Amino acid sequence: DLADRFAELERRYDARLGVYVPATGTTAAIEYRADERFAFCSTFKAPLVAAVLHQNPLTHLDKLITYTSDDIRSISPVAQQHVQTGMTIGQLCDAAIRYSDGTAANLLLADLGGPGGGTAAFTGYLRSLGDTVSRLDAEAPELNRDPPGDERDTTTPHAIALVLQQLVLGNALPPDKRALLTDWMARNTTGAKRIRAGFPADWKVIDKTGTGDYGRANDIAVVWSPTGVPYVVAVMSDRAGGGYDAEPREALLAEAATCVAGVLA
Ligand SMILES: *C(=O)[C@@H](NC(=O)[C@H](N)c1ccccc1)[C@@H]1N[C@@H](C(=O)O)C(C)(C)S1
């Protein structure tokens, strides 16, 4: 039984696990702790890129953004290198999704603009998609640090899956912008050991990960069967029992995804 398997994984990893797969043509929704809040961590970068794409003409991708030494405040594998040159909006989107670059995401939040360095506008974008649950309150590095249970900087597996479904499968974005987001997630470099590890190689997987303090490890994905039937998969986890420095455990997500894949096969 799925719920039993998910509970077994929680015990194995001393973790809290949340899973949501929306209902489809012939499958019921899969849900486990799906309405409990979990920190977004870097998963917010996927709808962030959607918001920036939606907000602007496509060629806003070519706008060069400049920044400085004091802007590097978080893991930023790509932006660390381009302080002098600056990065285009398209480069920032690419880095935010594919390398989970924190500076890139902070700069995208500032591009979106408005109160809270862009976090209010980000939240407003989610509200426009019918998500009355999620909230972003801080940028990097703070957004990954809220104590377990705190509602700041949280979503739920259910909420984020419905958002991702609209962005990738539905009509939240026009086809050209939708393809940009989809391709960046398809080319993600950080997800090999999470949802991807749970699905057979002949399933397509696109995803965006997040990792945070208190053992936080998330992954949100869209997967397509070998015959092109898509499913949205959100898996979220934390390990409050280990305190702030608890190690995130990717294997928990790989195992959860393997269980989901077994049901969807
Ligand atoms: C988003 O979740 C980001 N997380 C962090 O910057 C955390 N402070 C962190 C936790 C563990 C190791 C390094 C940083 C980025 N997204 C993560 C991910 O996509 O899983 C990351 C580890 C690639 S950094």
CSV table of C-alpha atoms and ligand atoms in Angstrom, one decimal:
chain,number,residue,atom,x,y,z
A,1,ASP,CA,0.0,0.0,0.0
A,2,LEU,CA,1.3,3.5,-1.0
A,3,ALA,CA,0.5,5.3,2.2
A,4,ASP,CA,2.2,2.4,4.1
A,5,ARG,CA,5.2,2.7,1.8
A,6,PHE,CA,5.5,6.4,2.3
A,7,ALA,CA,5.1,6.0,6.1
A,8,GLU,CA,7.9,3.4,6.0
A,9,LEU,CA,10.1,5.9,4.2
A,10,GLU,CA,9.5,8.6,6.8
A,11,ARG,CA,10.6,6.1,9.5
A,12,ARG,CA,13.7,5.1,7.4
A,13,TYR,CA,14.9,8.7,6.9
A,14,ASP,CA,13.6,10.2,10.2
A,15,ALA,CA,11.7,12.5,7.9
A,16,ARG,CA,8.4,14.1,7.1
A,17,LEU,CA,7.4,13.4,3.5
A,18,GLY,CA,4.8,15.1,1.3
A,19,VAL,CA,3.7,13.8,-2.1
A,20,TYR,CA,1.1,14.9,-4.7
A,21,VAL,CA,0.3,13.7,-8.1
A,22,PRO,CA,-2.8,15.4,-9.6
A,23,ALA,CA,-5.7,13.2,-10.9
A,24,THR,CA,-5.6,12.4,-14.6
A,25,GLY,CA,-7.8,10.7,-17.2
A,26,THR,CA,-7.7,7.3,-15.5
A,27,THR,CA,-5.7,7.8,-12.3
A,28,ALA,CA,-6.8,9.1,-8.9
A,29,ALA,CA,-4.7,11.8,-7.3
A,30,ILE,CA,-1.9,10.4,-5.2
A,31,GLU,CA,-1.6,12.3,-1.9
A,32,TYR,CA,0.4,11.9,1.2
A,33,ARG,CA,0.6,14.9,3.6
A,34,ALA,CA,-0.2,16.8,0.4
A,35,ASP,CA,-1.9,19.8,2.2
A,36,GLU,CA,0.8,20.2,4.8
A,37,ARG,CA,3.2,23.1,4.4
A,38,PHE,CA,6.8,22.5,3.4
A,39,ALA,CA,9.4,25.1,2.6
A,40,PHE,CA,9.6,25.9,-1.1
A,41,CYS,CA,13.4,26.1,-1.0
A,42,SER,CA,14.6,26.5,-4.6
A,43,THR,CA,11.5,25.0,-6.2
A,44,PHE,CA,10.0,28.5,-6.3
A,45,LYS,CA,12.5,29.3,-9.1
A,46,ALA,CA,10.3,27.4,-11.7
A,47,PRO,CA,7.2,29.6,-11.2
A,48,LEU,CA,9.6,32.6,-10.7
A,49,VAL,CA,10.9,32.1,-14.3
A,50,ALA,CA,7.3,31.7,-15.5
A,51,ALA,CA,6.3,35.0,-13.8
A,52,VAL,CA,9.2,36.8,-15.5
A,53,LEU,CA,8.5,35.3,-18.9
A,54,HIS,CA,4.8,36.1,-18.5
A,55,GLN,CA,5.4,39.7,-17.4
A,56,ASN,CA,7.6,40.7,-20.4
A,57,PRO,CA,8.0,40.5,-24.1
A,58,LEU,CA,10.1,37.4,-25.1
A,59,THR,CA,13.1,39.6,-26.1
A,60,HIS,CA,13.3,40.8,-22.5
A,61,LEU,CA,15.4,37.6,-22.3
A,62,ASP,CA,18.2,39.6,-24.1
A,63,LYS,CA,18.3,42.4,-21.5
A,64,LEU,CA,21.7,42.6,-19.7
A,65,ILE,CA,21.6,42.7,-15.9
A,66,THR,CA,24.5,44.0,-13.9
A,67,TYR,CA,25.3,43.2,-10.3
A,68,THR,CA,28.2,43.4,-7.8
A,69,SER,CA,30.3,41.5,-5.2
A,70,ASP,CA,27.8,42.1,-2.4
A,71,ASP,CA,25.0,40.4,-4.5
A,72,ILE,CA,26.6,37.0,-4.1
A,73,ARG,CA,25.0,35.9,-0.9
A,74,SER,CA,24.0,32.3,-1.6
A,75,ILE,CA,25.1,29.3,-3.7
A,76,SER,CA,25.4,30.7,-7.2
A,77,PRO,CA,27.4,28.5,-9.5
A,78,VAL,CA,26.9,30.6,-12.6
A,79,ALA,CA,26.4,34.1,-11.3
A,80,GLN,CA,29.6,33.9,-9.2
A,81,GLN,CA,31.5,34.2,-12.5
A,82,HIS,CA,29.7,37.1,-14.2
A,83,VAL,CA,29.9,40.0,-11.8
A,84,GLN,CA,31.9,42.0,-14.3
A,85,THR,CA,30.1,41.1,-17.5
A,86,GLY,CA,26.6,40.9,-16.1
A,87,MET,CA,24.1,38.3,-17.2
A,88,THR,CA,21.1,38.5,-19.5
A,89,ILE,CA,17.6,37.8,-18.2
A,90,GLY,CA,17.7,34.6,-20.3
A,91,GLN,CA,21.0,33.6,-18.7
A,92,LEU,CA,19.6,34.3,-15.3
A,93,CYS,CA,16.5,32.1,-16.0
A,94,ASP,CA,18.8,29.3,-17.3
A,95,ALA,CA,21.0,29.5,-14.2
A,96,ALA,CA,18.1,29.8,-11.8
A,97,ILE,CA,16.4,26.6,-13.1
A,98,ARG,CA,19.4,24.5,-14.3
A,99,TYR,CA,21.9,25.2,-11.6
A,100,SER,CA,19.6,26.6,-8.9
A,101,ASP,CA,21.6,29.7,-8.8
A,102,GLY,CA,20.5,31.8,-5.8
A,103,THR,CA,21.9,35.2,-7.1
A,104,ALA,CA,20.2,34.6,-10.4
A,105,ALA,CA,16.9,34.1,-8.6
A,106,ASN,CA,17.3,37.1,-6.4
A,107,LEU,CA,18.0,39.2,-9.5
A,108,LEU,CA,14.9,37.8,-11.2
A,109,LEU,CA,12.9,38.7,-8.1
A,110,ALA,CA,14.2,42.2,-8.4
A,111,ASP,CA,13.3,42.2,-12.1
A,112,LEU,CA,9.8,41.2,-11.3
A,113,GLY,CA,9.9,44.1,-8.8
A,114,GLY,CA,7.6,45.6,-6.2
A,115,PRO,CA,7.6,45.2,-2.4
A,116,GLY,CA,9.7,42.7,-0.6
A,117,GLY,CA,12.3,42.7,-3.4
A,118,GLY,CA,9.8,41.0,-5.7
A,119,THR,CA,8.5,38.4,-3.2
A,120,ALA,CA,5.1,40.0,-3.1
A,121,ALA,CA,4.8,40.1,-6.9
A,122,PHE,CA,5.9,36.4,-7.0
A,123,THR,CA,3.2,35.5,-4.5
A,124,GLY,CA,0.7,37.6,-6.6
A,125,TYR,CA,1.7,35.6,-9.7
A,126,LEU,CA,0.8,32.4,-7.8
A,127,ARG,CA,-2.5,33.9,-6.7
A,128,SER,CA,-3.3,34.6,-10.4
A,129,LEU,CA,-3.0,30.8,-10.9
A,130,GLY,CA,-5.6,30.1,-8.2
A,131,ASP,CA,-3.0,29.2,-5.6
A,132,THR,CA,-4.2,30.8,-2.3
A,133,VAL,CA,-1.9,28.7,-0.2
A,134,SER,CA,1.8,29.3,-1.2
A,135,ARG,CA,3.7,32.3,0.0
A,136,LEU,CA,7.2,33.7,-0.6
A,137,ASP,CA,8.5,36.1,2.1
A,138,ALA,CA,12.3,36.2,1.7
A,139,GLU,CA,14.9,35.7,-1.0
A,140,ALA,CA,18.1,33.8,-0.9
A,141,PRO,CA,19.7,32.7,1.5
A,142,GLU,CA,16.9,33.4,4.1
A,143,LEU,CA,14.1,31.5,2.4
A,144,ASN,CA,15.6,28.1,3.2
A,145,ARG,CA,16.1,28.9,6.9
A,146,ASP,CA,12.6,29.3,8.5
A,147,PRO,CA,12.0,27.0,11.5
A,148,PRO,CA,10.1,23.8,10.9
A,149,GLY,CA,6.4,24.6,11.0
A,150,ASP,CA,6.8,28.3,10.2
A,151,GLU,CA,4.5,29.3,7.4
A,152,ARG,CA,6.9,31.8,5.8
A,153,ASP,CA,8.3,30.7,2.4
A,154,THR,CA,6.1,27.7,2.2
A,155,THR,CA,4.0,25.8,-0.4
A,156,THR,CA,2.3,22.4,-0.2
A,157,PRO,CA,2.8,19.4,-2.5
A,158,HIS,CA,-0.8,19.9,-3.6
A,159,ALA,CA,-0.5,23.6,-4.3
A,160,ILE,CA,2.8,23.5,-6.2
A,161,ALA,CA,1.7,20.5,-8.3
A,162,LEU,CA,-1.4,22.5,-9.4
A,163,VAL,CA,0.8,25.5,-10.2
A,164,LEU,CA,3.3,23.4,-12.2
A,165,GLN,CA,0.5,21.6,-14.0
A,166,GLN,CA,-0.8,25.0,-15.3
A,167,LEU,CA,2.6,26.2,-16.3
A,168,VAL,CA,3.8,23.2,-18.2
A,169,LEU,CA,0.7,21.3,-19.3
A,170,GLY,CA,-2.0,24.0,-19.2
A,171,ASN,CA,-2.3,27.5,-20.6
A,172,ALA,CA,-0.8,29.8,-18.0
A,173,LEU,CA,1.9,30.7,-20.5
A,174,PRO,CA,1.7,31.1,-24.2
A,175,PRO,CA,3.3,28.2,-26.2
A,176,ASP,CA,6.6,30.0,-26.9
A,177,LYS,CA,7.2,31.0,-23.2
A,178,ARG,CA,5.9,27.6,-22.1
A,179,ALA,CA,8.5,25.9,-24.3
A,180,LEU,CA,11.3,28.0,-22.8
A,181,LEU,CA,10.3,27.0,-19.2
A,182,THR,CA,9.8,23.4,-20.2
A,183,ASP,CA,13.2,23.1,-21.9
A,184,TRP,CA,15.1,24.7,-19.0
A,185,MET,CA,13.5,22.2,-16.6
A,186,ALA,CA,14.3,19.4,-19.1
A,187,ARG,CA,17.9,20.4,-19.0
A,188,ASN,CA,18.1,20.7,-15.2
A,189,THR,CA,21.5,19.5,-13.9
A,190,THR,CA,20.6,19.1,-10.2
A,191,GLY,CA,17.8,16.4,-10.3
A,192,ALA,CA,19.5,13.1,-11.2
A,193,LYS,CA,19.1,11.6,-7.8
A,194,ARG,CA,15.5,12.6,-7.1
A,195,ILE,CA,12.3,12.1,-9.1
A,196,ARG,CA,14.4,11.2,-12.2
A,197,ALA,CA,15.9,8.3,-10.3
A,198,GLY,CA,12.5,6.9,-9.6
A,199,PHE,CA,11.2,6.7,-13.2
A,200,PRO,CA,12.3,4.3,-16.0
A,201,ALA,CA,14.7,5.8,-18.6
A,202,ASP,CA,12.0,5.7,-21.3
A,203,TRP,CA,9.9,8.2,-19.3
A,204,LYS,CA,10.7,11.9,-20.0
A,205,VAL,CA,11.4,13.9,-16.8
A,206,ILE,CA,11.7,17.6,-16.4
A,207,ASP,CA,12.2,19.0,-12.9
A,208,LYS,CA,13.2,21.7,-10.4
A,209,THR,CA,14.8,20.7,-7.1
A,210,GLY,CA,15.2,22.5,-3.8
A,211,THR,CA,17.3,21.8,-0.7
A,212,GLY,CA,17.4,23.7,2.6
A,213,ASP,CA,18.2,23.6,6.2
A,214,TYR,CA,16.5,21.1,8.6
A,215,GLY,CA,17.2,18.4,6.1
A,216,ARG,CA,14.9,19.9,3.5
A,217,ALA,CA,14.9,18.2,0.1
A,218,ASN,CA,12.2,18.8,-2.6
A,219,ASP,CA,11.7,18.0,-6.2
A,220,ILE,CA,8.8,19.1,-8.5
A,221,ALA,CA,8.5,17.5,-11.9
A,222,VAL,CA,6.5,16.8,-15.0
A,223,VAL,CA,7.0,13.3,-16.4
A,224,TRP,CA,5.7,11.7,-19.6
A,225,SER,CA,5.1,8.1,-20.1
A,226,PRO,CA,6.7,6.3,-23.2
A,227,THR,CA,3.4,7.0,-25.0
A,228,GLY,CA,3.3,10.7,-24.0
A,229,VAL,CA,0.9,10.7,-21.1
A,230,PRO,CA,2.0,13.4,-18.6
A,231,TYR,CA,1.8,13.4,-14.9
A,232,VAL,CA,2.9,16.1,-12.4
A,233,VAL,CA,4.9,14.9,-9.4
A,234,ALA,CA,5.6,17.0,-6.3
A,235,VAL,CA,7.7,15.5,-3.5
A,236,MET,CA,8.8,17.5,-0.5
A,237,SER,CA,10.6,16.5,2.7
A,238,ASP,CA,12.3,17.7,5.9
A,239,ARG,CA,14.0,16.2,8.9
A,240,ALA,CA,13.2,18.5,11.8
A,241,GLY,CA,14.5,15.9,14.3
A,242,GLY,CA,18.0,16.6,13.2
A,243,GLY,CA,17.8,20.3,13.8
A,244,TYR,CA,19.1,23.1,11.5
A,245,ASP,CA,22.1,21.1,10.2
A,246,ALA,CA,20.1,17.9,9.5
A,247,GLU,CA,21.4,16.4,6.2
A,248,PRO,CA,18.9,16.5,3.3
A,249,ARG,CA,18.4,12.9,2.0
A,250,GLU,CA,17.9,12.7,-1.7
A,251,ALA,CA,17.4,9.0,-1.5
A,252,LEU,CA,14.1,9.6,0.3
A,253,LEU,CA,12.8,11.4,-2.8
A,254,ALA,CA,14.2,8.8,-5.2
A,255,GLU,CA,12.4,6.0,-3.3
A,256,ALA,CA,9.1,8.0,-3.0
A,257,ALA,CA,9.3,8.6,-6.8
A,258,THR,CA,10.0,4.9,-7.4
A,259,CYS,CA,6.8,4.1,-5.5
A,260,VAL,CA,4.8,6.7,-7.5
A,261,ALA,CA,6.3,5.4,-10.8
A,262,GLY,CA,5.2,1.8,-9.9
A,263,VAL,CA,1.6,3.0,-9.5
A,264,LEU,CA,1.7,5.1,-12.7
A,265,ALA,CA,3.2,2.3,-14.9
B,1,LIG,C1,17.6,26.0,-3.3
B,1,LIG,O1,17.0,25.1,-2.7
B,1,LIG,C2,19.1,26.3,-3.1
B,1,LIG,N1,19.4,25.8,-1.7
B,1,LIG,C3,20.4,26.3,-1.1
B,1,LIG,O2,21.1,27.3,-1.5
B,1,LIG,C4,20.7,25.6,0.3
B,1,LIG,N2,21.3,26.6,1.2
B,1,LIG,C5,21.6,24.4,0.1
B,1,LIG,C6,21.4,23.2,0.7
B,1,LIG,C7,22.2,22.1,0.6
B,1,LIG,C8,23.4,22.2,-0.2
B,1,LIG,C9,23.7,23.5,-0.8
B,1,LIG,C10,22.8,24.5,-0.6
B,1,LIG,C11,19.8,25.6,-4.3
B,1,LIG,N3,19.0,24.5,-4.8
B,1,LIG,C12,19.5,23.2,-4.3
B,1,LIG,C13,18.8,22.2,-5.2
B,1,LIG,O3,18.3,22.5,-6.2
B,1,LIG,O4,18.6,21.0,-4.7
B,1,LIG,C14,21.0,23.2,-4.5
B,1,LIG,C15,21.6,22.2,-3.4
B,1,LIG,C16,21.5,22.8,-5.9
B,1,LIG,S1,21.5,24.9,-4.0
